Structure 1
Amino acid sequence: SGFRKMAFPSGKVEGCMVQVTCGTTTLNGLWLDDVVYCPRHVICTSEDMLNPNYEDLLIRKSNHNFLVQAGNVQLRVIGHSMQNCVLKLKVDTANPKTPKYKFVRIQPGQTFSVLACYNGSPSGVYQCAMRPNFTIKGSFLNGSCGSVGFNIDYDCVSFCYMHHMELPTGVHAGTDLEGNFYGPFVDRQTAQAAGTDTTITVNVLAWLYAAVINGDRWFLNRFTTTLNDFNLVAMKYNYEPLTQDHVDILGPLSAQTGIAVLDMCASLKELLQNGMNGRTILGSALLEDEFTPFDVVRQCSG
């Protein structure tokens, strides 16, 4: 029993974190086989913040301009190339700790673990979710760029996020491991603002199902709703639209608990209307939206 915000064990990713230095800038790199991946803005100077021409800045660099340090060991850079907003540094040594891995670009609402690192060394691991506005609500200090987000399927590491910058509202933006930013953001210091964020409705419903599995039913009701009436109500609370795709995803959790998906939708509508009235659900006085249906089944069933 119990339900916690659970991250993946970080050891497989820890063995891949290195430090990348270019000029006076130092951030984190991801060392997989004989390639080190890091944000391309490591090559920017103080005058290259607003409108850097990365092709022009990169063509001026030599392999020895990049200092890559793995633990107490300097790796020799033997080549470099740009792919979108990430830099790929070819090194003369394959990482002997390289796990089974792949790169996956995730969709809003998906969750992943973040290994926050500074100077190539991990600081902590926590759980995140891609917000509907393509930001993440992380915990990052200066020097955390190049930290990665990931999931682990059995023993294969799925890298899905690399940290690039913090927006003025204190939220964070980054790329997949192919260098493509999540959302409309760019690696420039020009004024950028995240769109108004919304609640991940399918995740809230999955987390209500988790509460029932763990033995709590106080929030259910005798009502149901149509899918459209639910959405008409939920939008007024800044909730994401619930699609038929989302209803299908919740099928297994519905079958396990015996509560139809649209019945849970009616329970959610009432919670938004009433609040919790001094009660809690799985230890929280707010509705939690950073547990996916996949997260719930993995944590509640193994």
Structure 2
Amino acid sequence: SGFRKMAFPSGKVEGCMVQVTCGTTTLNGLWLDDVVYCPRHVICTSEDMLNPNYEDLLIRKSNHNFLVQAGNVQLRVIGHSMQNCVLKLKVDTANPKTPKYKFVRIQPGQTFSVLACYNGSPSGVYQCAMRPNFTIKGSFLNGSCGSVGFNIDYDCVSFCYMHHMELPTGVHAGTDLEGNFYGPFVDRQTAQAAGTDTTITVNVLAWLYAAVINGDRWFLNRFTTTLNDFNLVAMKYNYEPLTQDHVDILGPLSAQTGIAVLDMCASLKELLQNGMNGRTILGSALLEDEFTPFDVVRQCSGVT
């Protein structure tokens, strides 16, 4: 019993973290096989960041200008290329600690663990969600760029996120491991709008199933609703419209608890319309949307 915002064990990712220096800039890199991936803004200076011409800036750089340090050993750089907003530094040594890995582009609403790093050294690990507006509400400071987000399926690490920017609003923006930013964000120090962020309805419902599984049942009621009626309420409270796909994904949790998905929606509808009334659910005074149905099943069944 008990339910926590659990992150994946970070060991497989710590073994890939390197430090990348280019000129005066130092940030983190990801060493997998003979390649170090890092944000391309490592080649920029404080003046450059207003409107950098990355192709022009990268032309002024040679393999020897990229200093890559793994712990305390220096890696020799034999190649450099730009792929979208990431630089790929080919090194002469394959990382002996490379785990089985994939590069995956996650969907908004999906969750992942972040290993925040500074100077190629890991400082902490936390569980995040890619917001519907493609931002992440992380915990990153100057030097954290290059820190990655990932998921783990037994021995395979799926890298999904690389940290690049903090938006003026304090929220975080980054790329997949191919350098494609999530959302409309560009790697420029300019005014950038994160869209309207909605609440991940399927995740909130999954978390209500986790609550019932773990003893918190007060919010359960004698009511039911329809997908259309529920979505009228979701619209008003800036929640993601619930679809039959979402209902189907909640199927295992519905079967485990014996509470029909639309019955759980009616409970959520009443929580949205009436609030918590000073009560808590799983130790929280708000509706938690950073646990997917998969996270709930995994945590409630002890998947290692």
Aligned match of 1:288: 288
CA shift for structure 1 position 37: 0.1
Distance 1:79 1:284 in 2: 49
Q: How far 1:188 sits from its partner (Å)? A: 0.8
CA contact 1:168–1:193 (8 Å) conserved in 2: no
Q: Deviations over 1:88-145 (max 9, x none)?
A: 0000111000001111000011110000000000000011000011000000000000
Show structure 1 runs of 5+ residues with no match: none
* Greater Cα offset, 47-56 or 130-139: 47-56
Aligned length: 302
Give, in angstroms, the shift of residue 243 of structure 1: 1.4
Provide the C-alpha distance between the structure 1 equivalents of 2:90 and 2:136, rounded to a whole number of angstroms. Answer: 29
Structure 1 residue 240: deviation in Å? 1.1
Distance 1:91 1:267 in 2: 55
How far did 1:71 drift?
0.6
Say if 1:52 and 1:188, in contact at 8 Å, map to a contact too.
Answer: yes
* Residue 278 of structure 1: how far off its partner (Å): 2.2
Give % identity: 100
Match of 1:273 in 2: 273
Rounded Cα–Cα distance in structure 1 between residues aligned with 2:184 and 2:41 = 17
Secondary structure of 1:49 counterpart: helix
Output one character per residue of 1:122-181: Cα deviation in whole Å (capped at 9) or x when no partner.
Answer: 000011000011000000000000000011000110100000000111100000001100
Quote the residue 1:129 is aligned against: 129
Partners in 2 of 1:74 and 1:170 — Cα distance? 34
Distance, in Å, in 2 between the alignment partners of 1:301 and 1:147 is 29
The range that moved more, 108-117 or 215-224, is 215-224
- How far is 1:234 from its partner? 1.2
CA distance in 2, matches of 1:60, 1:183: 29
Structure 1 residue 195, shift from structure 2 partner: 1.4
**CA distance in 2 between partners of 1:239 and 1:185 (Å):** 23
Q: Work out whether residues 101 and 159 of structure 1, in 8 Å CA contact, stay in contact via their aligned partners in 2.
A: yes
Taking the aligned partners of 1:231 and 1:284, their CA distance within structure 2 comes to 24
Alignment partner, residue 224 of structure 1: 224
SS in structure 1 at match of 2:114: strand
Most deviating of 272-281 and 23-32: 272-281
Once the two structures are TM-superposed, the CA of residue 254 in structure 1 deviates from its matched residue by 0.5
Task: Kindly provide the CA deviation profile for residues 41-86 of structure 1, in whole angstroms up to 9, marking residues without a partner as x.
Answer: 1011222212211111112211000000011111000001111110
3-state SS of paired residue (1:97): coil
Superposition RMSD in Å: 0.8
> How much does 1:11 deviate?
0.6
* Range moving further from structure 2, 74-83 or 217-226: 217-226
The superposition leaves residues 156-213 of structure 1 with CA deviations (integer Å, 9 ceiling, x where unpaired) of: 1010000000011110000000110000001111211211211111000000000111
User: How far off its partner does 1:238 sit?
Assistant: 1.1
Q: Structure 2: give runs of 5+ residues left out of the alignment.
A: none
CA distance in structure 2 between the partners assigned to 1:80 and 1:276 by the alignment? 54
Normalising by structure 1, we get a TM-score of 0.99
Q: Distance in 1 between matches of 2:165 and 2:215?
A: 41
Distance 2:208 2:137 in 1: 22
Structure 1 stretches of 4+ with a deviation exceeding 4 A read none
Shift of 1:10: 0.4
Equivalent residues of 1:107, 1:130 under 8 A apart:
yes
TM-score (norm 2): 0.98
CA contact (8 A) 1:225 1:263 kept: yes
The offset of 1:216, in angstroms, is: 2.3
